[PDB]
Short mmCIF file of C-alpha atoms and ligand atoms in Angstrom, two decimals:
data_model
loop_
_atom_site.label_atom_id
_atom_site.label_comp_id
_atom_site.label_asym_id
_atom_site.label_seq_id
_atom_site.Cartn_x
_atom_site.Cartn_y
_atom_site.Cartn_z
CA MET A 1 -0.03 -0.09 -0.01
CA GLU A 2 0.75 3.80 -0.06
CA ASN A 3 0.48 3.94 3.76
CA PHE A 4 3.04 1.16 4.24
CA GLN A 5 6.58 0.73 3.45
CA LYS A 6 7.50 -2.89 2.60
CA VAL A 7 10.55 -3.99 4.81
CA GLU A 8 10.77 -7.37 3.37
CA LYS A 9 8.55 -10.31 2.09
CA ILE A 10 8.30 -12.83 4.82
CA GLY A 11 6.03 -15.58 3.12
CA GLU A 12 3.95 -16.60 0.12
CA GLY A 13 0.99 -18.75 -0.10
CA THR A 14 -1.56 -19.94 -2.65
CA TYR A 15 -3.72 -17.02 -2.05
CA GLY A 16 -1.75 -14.21 -0.52
CA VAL A 17 1.85 -12.76 0.21
CA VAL A 18 2.87 -11.57 3.58
CA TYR A 19 5.17 -8.65 4.08
CA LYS A 20 6.94 -7.07 7.15
CA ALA A 21 5.94 -3.54 6.69
CA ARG A 22 6.21 -0.14 8.52
CA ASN A 23 3.11 2.28 9.00
CA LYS A 24 4.67 5.31 7.30
CA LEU A 25 2.79 7.48 9.77
CA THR A 26 2.54 5.70 13.08
CA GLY A 27 5.81 3.98 12.63
CA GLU A 28 4.37 0.75 13.89
CA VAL A 29 5.81 -2.53 12.39
CA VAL A 30 3.21 -4.98 11.13
CA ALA A 31 2.74 -8.03 9.12
CA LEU A 32 0.57 -7.15 5.93
CA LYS A 33 -1.12 -9.94 3.96
CA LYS A 34 -2.00 -8.88 0.40
CA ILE A 35 -4.74 -10.89 -1.37
CA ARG A 36 -5.65 -10.45 -5.02
CA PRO A 37 -16.74 -11.35 -1.49
CA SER A 38 -19.35 -10.31 1.24
CA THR A 39 -19.61 -13.36 3.31
CA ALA A 40 -15.73 -13.71 3.37
CA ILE A 41 -15.08 -10.01 4.11
CA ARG A 42 -17.78 -10.15 6.72
CA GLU A 43 -16.22 -13.43 8.03
CA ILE A 44 -12.91 -11.43 8.39
CA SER A 45 -14.48 -8.49 10.10
CA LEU A 46 -15.55 -11.09 12.60
CA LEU A 47 -11.86 -12.21 13.24
CA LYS A 48 -11.19 -8.60 14.20
CA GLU A 49 -12.99 -9.15 17.36
CA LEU A 50 -11.19 -12.35 18.22
CA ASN A 51 -8.87 -11.12 20.81
CA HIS A 52 -6.84 -13.58 22.95
CA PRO A 53 -3.32 -13.61 23.95
CA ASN A 54 -2.39 -16.69 21.82
CA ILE A 55 -4.21 -15.33 18.69
CA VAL A 56 -2.32 -12.93 16.46
CA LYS A 57 -4.15 -9.59 16.62
CA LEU A 58 -5.80 -8.57 13.30
CA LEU A 59 -5.42 -4.76 13.39
CA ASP A 60 -7.04 -3.68 10.17
CA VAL A 61 -8.83 -4.87 7.03
CA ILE A 62 -8.50 -2.83 3.88
CA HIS A 63 -10.46 -3.75 0.68
CA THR A 64 -9.40 -1.58 -2.25
CA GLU A 65 -8.20 -1.67 -5.89
CA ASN A 66 -9.17 -5.25 -6.38
CA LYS A 67 -6.90 -6.21 -3.36
CA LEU A 68 -7.58 -7.21 0.21
CA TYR A 69 -4.98 -6.24 2.82
CA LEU A 70 -5.13 -7.70 6.33
CA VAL A 71 -2.83 -5.93 8.88
CA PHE A 72 -1.61 -7.91 11.83
CA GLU A 73 0.54 -7.30 14.71
CA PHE A 74 4.03 -8.50 13.92
CA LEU A 75 5.91 -11.44 15.58
CA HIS A 76 9.55 -12.03 15.07
CA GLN A 77 9.67 -15.79 14.24
CA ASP A 78 7.48 -18.73 13.20
CA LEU A 79 7.68 -22.07 14.83
CA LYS A 80 9.05 -23.80 11.59
CA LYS A 81 12.16 -21.54 11.73
CA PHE A 82 12.48 -22.12 15.40
CA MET A 83 12.31 -25.81 15.01
CA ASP A 84 14.75 -25.67 12.16
CA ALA A 85 17.11 -23.58 14.46
CA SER A 86 16.57 -26.10 17.33
CA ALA A 87 17.12 -29.28 15.17
CA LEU A 88 20.63 -30.12 16.59
CA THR A 89 19.57 -30.08 20.20
CA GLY A 90 15.83 -30.12 20.18
CA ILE A 91 13.32 -27.68 21.84
CA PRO A 92 13.50 -28.38 25.57
CA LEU A 93 10.51 -30.25 26.75
CA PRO A 94 9.21 -27.59 29.08
CA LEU A 95 8.99 -25.14 26.18
CA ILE A 96 7.41 -27.66 23.93
CA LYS A 97 4.81 -28.21 26.78
CA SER A 98 4.39 -24.35 27.28
CA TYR A 99 3.79 -23.95 23.53
CA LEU A 100 1.41 -26.78 23.23
CA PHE A 101 -0.59 -25.60 26.30
CA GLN A 102 -0.73 -21.92 24.81
CA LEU A 103 -1.85 -23.11 21.40
CA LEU A 104 -4.59 -25.33 23.08
CA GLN A 105 -5.79 -22.04 25.05
CA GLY A 106 -6.02 -20.21 21.75
CA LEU A 107 -7.92 -23.03 20.06
CA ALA A 108 -10.19 -23.42 23.17
CA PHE A 109 -10.93 -19.73 22.74
CA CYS A 110 -11.72 -19.62 18.88
CA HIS A 111 -13.57 -23.05 19.08
CA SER A 112 -15.79 -21.61 21.95
CA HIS A 113 -16.43 -18.63 19.50
CA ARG A 114 -17.28 -21.15 16.64
CA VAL A 115 -14.09 -20.19 14.79
CA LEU A 116 -11.99 -22.85 13.23
CA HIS A 117 -8.47 -22.38 11.96
CA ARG A 118 -8.35 -25.25 9.29
CA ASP A 119 -4.79 -24.98 8.31
CA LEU A 120 -2.48 -24.98 11.46
CA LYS A 121 1.22 -25.66 10.64
CA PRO A 122 4.57 -24.47 12.00
CA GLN A 123 4.76 -21.72 9.53
CA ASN A 124 1.64 -20.11 10.81
CA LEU A 125 2.46 -20.41 14.64
CA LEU A 126 4.33 -17.47 15.73
CA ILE A 127 6.51 -16.88 18.59
CA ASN A 128 8.02 -13.80 20.55
CA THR A 129 10.99 -13.33 22.94
CA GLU A 130 8.71 -13.46 25.83
CA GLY A 131 7.88 -17.12 25.66
CA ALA A 132 4.33 -16.67 23.88
CA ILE A 133 3.20 -18.42 20.83
CA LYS A 134 0.31 -17.42 18.70
CA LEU A 135 -2.13 -18.76 16.05
CA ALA A 136 -1.84 -16.70 12.81
CA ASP A 137 -3.30 -17.00 9.26
CA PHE A 138 -6.72 -18.28 10.06
CA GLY A 139 -8.21 -20.05 7.03
CA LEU A 140 -11.77 -19.18 5.98
CA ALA A 141 -14.53 -21.56 5.18
CA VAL A 142 2.98 -26.50 -3.08
CA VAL A 143 0.45 -26.81 -0.25
CA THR A 144 1.60 -28.65 2.81
CA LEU A 145 -0.71 -31.60 3.56
CA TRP A 146 1.26 -32.79 6.54
CA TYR A 147 -0.98 -31.49 9.29
CA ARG A 148 -4.26 -32.34 7.52
CA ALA A 149 -6.95 -34.28 9.55
CA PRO A 150 -7.93 -37.51 7.95
CA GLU A 151 -11.60 -36.65 7.71
CA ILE A 152 -10.63 -33.74 5.36
CA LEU A 153 -8.53 -36.22 3.33
CA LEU A 154 -11.50 -38.52 3.09
CA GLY A 155 -13.61 -35.93 1.71
CA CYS A 156 -15.78 -34.71 4.45
CA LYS A 157 -17.68 -31.46 3.54
CA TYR A 158 -18.17 -30.09 6.92
CA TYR A 159 -14.94 -29.63 9.09
CA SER A 160 -15.33 -29.66 12.83
CA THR A 161 -13.11 -28.10 15.51
CA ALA A 162 -11.60 -31.45 15.73
CA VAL A 163 -9.42 -30.70 12.68
CA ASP A 164 -7.36 -28.23 14.53
CA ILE A 165 -6.71 -30.63 17.35
CA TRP A 166 -5.35 -33.18 14.73
CA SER A 167 -3.09 -30.60 13.13
CA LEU A 168 -1.82 -29.45 16.54
CA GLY A 169 -1.06 -33.13 17.67
CA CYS A 170 0.95 -33.39 14.46
CA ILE A 171 2.94 -30.48 15.29
CA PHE A 172 3.26 -31.54 18.89
CA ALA A 173 4.79 -34.78 17.76
CA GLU A 174 7.16 -32.94 15.34
CA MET A 175 8.38 -30.65 18.06
CA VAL A 176 9.32 -33.79 20.32
CA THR A 177 10.98 -35.82 17.53
CA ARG A 178 12.26 -33.31 15.29
CA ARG A 179 10.76 -34.87 12.26
CA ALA A 180 7.32 -34.39 10.73
CA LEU A 181 5.11 -37.06 11.73
CA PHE A 182 3.26 -37.66 8.59
CA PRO A 183 5.15 -36.12 5.74
CA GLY A 184 2.99 -36.95 2.62
CA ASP A 185 3.66 -35.56 -0.66
CA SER A 186 0.06 -36.02 -2.11
CA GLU A 187 -3.40 -36.54 -0.64
CA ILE A 188 -3.16 -40.30 -0.95
CA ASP A 189 0.37 -40.57 0.30
CA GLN A 190 -0.58 -38.35 3.21
CA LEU A 191 -3.72 -40.61 3.96
CA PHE A 192 -1.58 -43.68 3.68
CA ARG A 193 1.19 -42.53 5.98
CA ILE A 194 -1.45 -41.79 8.55
CA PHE A 195 -2.87 -45.33 8.02
CA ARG A 196 0.72 -46.91 8.13
CA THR A 197 1.35 -45.45 11.53
CA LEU A 198 -2.05 -45.40 13.20
CA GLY A 199 -3.70 -48.36 11.48
CA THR A 200 -6.20 -48.21 8.56
CA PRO A 201 -9.31 -47.07 10.15
CA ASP A 202 -12.50 -49.12 10.15
CA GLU A 203 -16.01 -49.03 11.55
CA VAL A 204 -14.79 -50.19 14.87
CA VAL A 205 -12.62 -47.19 15.63
CA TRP A 206 -14.28 -44.65 13.28
CA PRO A 207 -18.08 -45.39 12.85
CA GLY A 208 -19.17 -44.20 9.34
CA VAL A 209 -15.59 -43.98 7.85
CA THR A 210 -16.31 -46.64 5.11
CA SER A 211 -19.21 -44.39 3.89
CA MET A 212 -17.10 -41.32 3.57
CA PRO A 213 -16.82 -39.54 0.13
CA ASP A 214 -13.23 -40.65 -0.85
CA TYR A 215 -13.03 -43.94 1.14
CA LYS A 216 -12.34 -46.88 -1.00
CA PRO A 217 -12.82 -50.36 0.26
CA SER A 218 -9.68 -51.11 -1.84
CA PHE A 219 -7.46 -49.08 0.70
CA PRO A 220 -4.63 -51.35 1.95
CA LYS A 221 -5.16 -52.64 5.56
CA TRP A 222 -2.21 -51.61 7.68
CA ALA A 223 -1.86 -52.57 11.35
CA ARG A 224 -1.46 -49.82 14.03
CA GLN A 225 1.94 -49.22 15.05
CA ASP A 226 3.04 -49.38 18.71
CA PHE A 227 2.81 -45.84 19.81
CA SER A 228 6.02 -45.88 21.85
CA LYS A 229 7.87 -46.05 18.49
CA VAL A 230 6.03 -43.04 17.10
CA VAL A 231 7.26 -40.44 19.61
CA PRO A 232 9.94 -42.25 21.76
CA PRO A 233 11.47 -39.33 23.64
CA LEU A 234 7.80 -38.41 24.90
CA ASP A 235 6.91 -39.68 28.38
CA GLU A 236 3.55 -41.51 28.93
CA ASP A 237 1.57 -38.40 29.79
CA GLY A 238 2.67 -36.78 26.63
CA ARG A 239 2.02 -39.90 24.54
CA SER A 240 -1.46 -40.29 26.29
CA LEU A 241 -2.38 -36.74 25.33
CA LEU A 242 -1.01 -37.09 21.75
CA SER A 243 -3.09 -40.30 21.24
CA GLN A 244 -6.18 -38.53 22.11
CA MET A 245 -5.31 -35.63 19.74
CA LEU A 246 -4.93 -38.29 16.91
CA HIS A 247 -8.11 -40.29 17.36
CA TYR A 248 -9.54 -41.11 14.02
CA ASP A 249 -13.13 -40.48 14.98
CA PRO A 250 -13.67 -36.49 14.96
CA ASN A 251 -16.07 -37.12 17.82
CA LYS A 252 -13.67 -39.13 19.91
CA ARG A 253 -10.73 -36.62 19.38
CA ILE A 254 -10.09 -34.65 22.51
CA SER A 255 -11.25 -31.00 22.51
CA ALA A 256 -8.94 -28.22 23.24
CA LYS A 257 -10.66 -27.60 26.68
CA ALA A 258 -10.37 -31.20 27.68
CA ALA A 259 -6.76 -31.28 26.56
CA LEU A 260 -5.95 -28.32 28.78
CA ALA A 261 -6.89 -30.44 31.87
CA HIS A 262 -4.85 -33.43 30.75
CA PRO A 263 -2.17 -34.70 33.30
CA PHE A 264 0.65 -33.77 30.96
CA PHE A 265 0.16 -30.04 31.85
CA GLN A 266 0.49 -30.61 35.63
CA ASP A 267 3.87 -29.14 35.69
CA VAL A 268 3.49 -26.57 32.78
CA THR A 269 5.62 -23.42 33.10
CA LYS A 270 6.40 -20.54 30.65
CA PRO A 271 10.03 -20.71 29.73
CA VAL A 272 11.97 -18.15 27.66
CA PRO A 273 13.02 -19.51 24.19
CA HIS A 274 16.56 -18.77 22.94
CA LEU A 275 15.79 -16.68 19.71
CA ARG A 276 18.06 -15.59 17.29
CA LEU A 277 16.46 -12.90 15.26
N1 03Z B 1 1.77 -11.47 12.21
C1 03Z B 1 2.80 -12.10 11.58
N2 03Z B 1 4.00 -11.90 11.88
C2 03Z B 1 4.89 -12.57 11.11
N3 03Z B 1 6.22 -12.52 11.22
C3 03Z B 1 7.19 -13.45 10.99
C4 03Z B 1 6.93 -14.76 10.24
C5 03Z B 1 7.90 -15.60 10.04
C6 03Z B 1 9.34 -15.12 10.19
S1 03Z B 1 10.58 -16.19 9.97
N4 03Z B 1 10.34 -17.00 8.80
O1 03Z B 1 10.78 -17.14 11.22
O2 03Z B 1 11.99 -15.37 9.73
C7 03Z B 1 9.64 -14.01 10.83
C8 03Z B 1 8.58 -13.06 11.24
S2 03Z B 1 3.98 -13.55 9.94
C9 03Z B 1 2.56 -13.00 10.47
C10 03Z B 1 1.13 -13.44 10.07
O3 03Z B 1 0.09 -13.00 10.48
C11 03Z B 1 1.08 -14.41 9.03
C12 03Z B 1 0.27 -14.36 7.86
C13 03Z B 1 0.18 -15.18 6.77
C14 03Z B 1 0.85 -16.45 6.85
C15 03Z B 1 1.69 -16.67 8.06
C16 03Z B 1 1.69 -15.88 9.06
#
């Protein structure tokens, strides 16, 4: 825009580009997403009221010249970069726990306001020097499929808040092991990597799964893998919580509210991360 001086591009997606920018007048530093309807723009105006310490603040929405600009408070690093920077040693468990706890608080909040994120991934989880982590780039009602819930992959038409819990469980596992849990490179490879680890779902663990849009009786039947092999460095409380975030049945999958009460968070604290900016 004219009122903003681009400092640098900080990301690109299949629907918008995000820039670090400075308000030529107020001098405030922000993240500005540029996109090239009515229900949508109104769905966005709603996001503006969504204020929580673990949700990136949407400051302004400007629709002009066939472009839609969203102005957000700026955070200095995303979780993908922090995880890469922490690959040699790993993020200490207490910080992993703090981040997971905070993200669950953010989801508990949006979900209670009937707002779903739909596309959680390390690149849209932002952190600051104070130890906070916040949800960014909420999705409206080469793409990474790694954090996609199985019901989406199987063609469900109506997502539930459970899709966000699944994505967060995948991210939790990745922080712990320092390797993506299900790194699929296509929708079917993504689905099959999930099946190879958690077992091919059936009517027993997921009632109604065989009648889903993209379910094929021809899917291979893989046995579920021992969970202790999936995220070895994780203690039993963590594995227990993870297994609940990764239940196949969206209705059995733990809610963010319930997850916050899990024994895993009994000793949660808020550590300071070591951030190189
Ligand atoms: N508020 C906000 N601040 C951001 N700063 C940022 C992001 C990454 C890095 S990096 N790669 O670690 O050097 C450094 C700063 S991004 C952002 C968004 O709201 C957003 C928008 C669309 C998609 C994803 C995020």
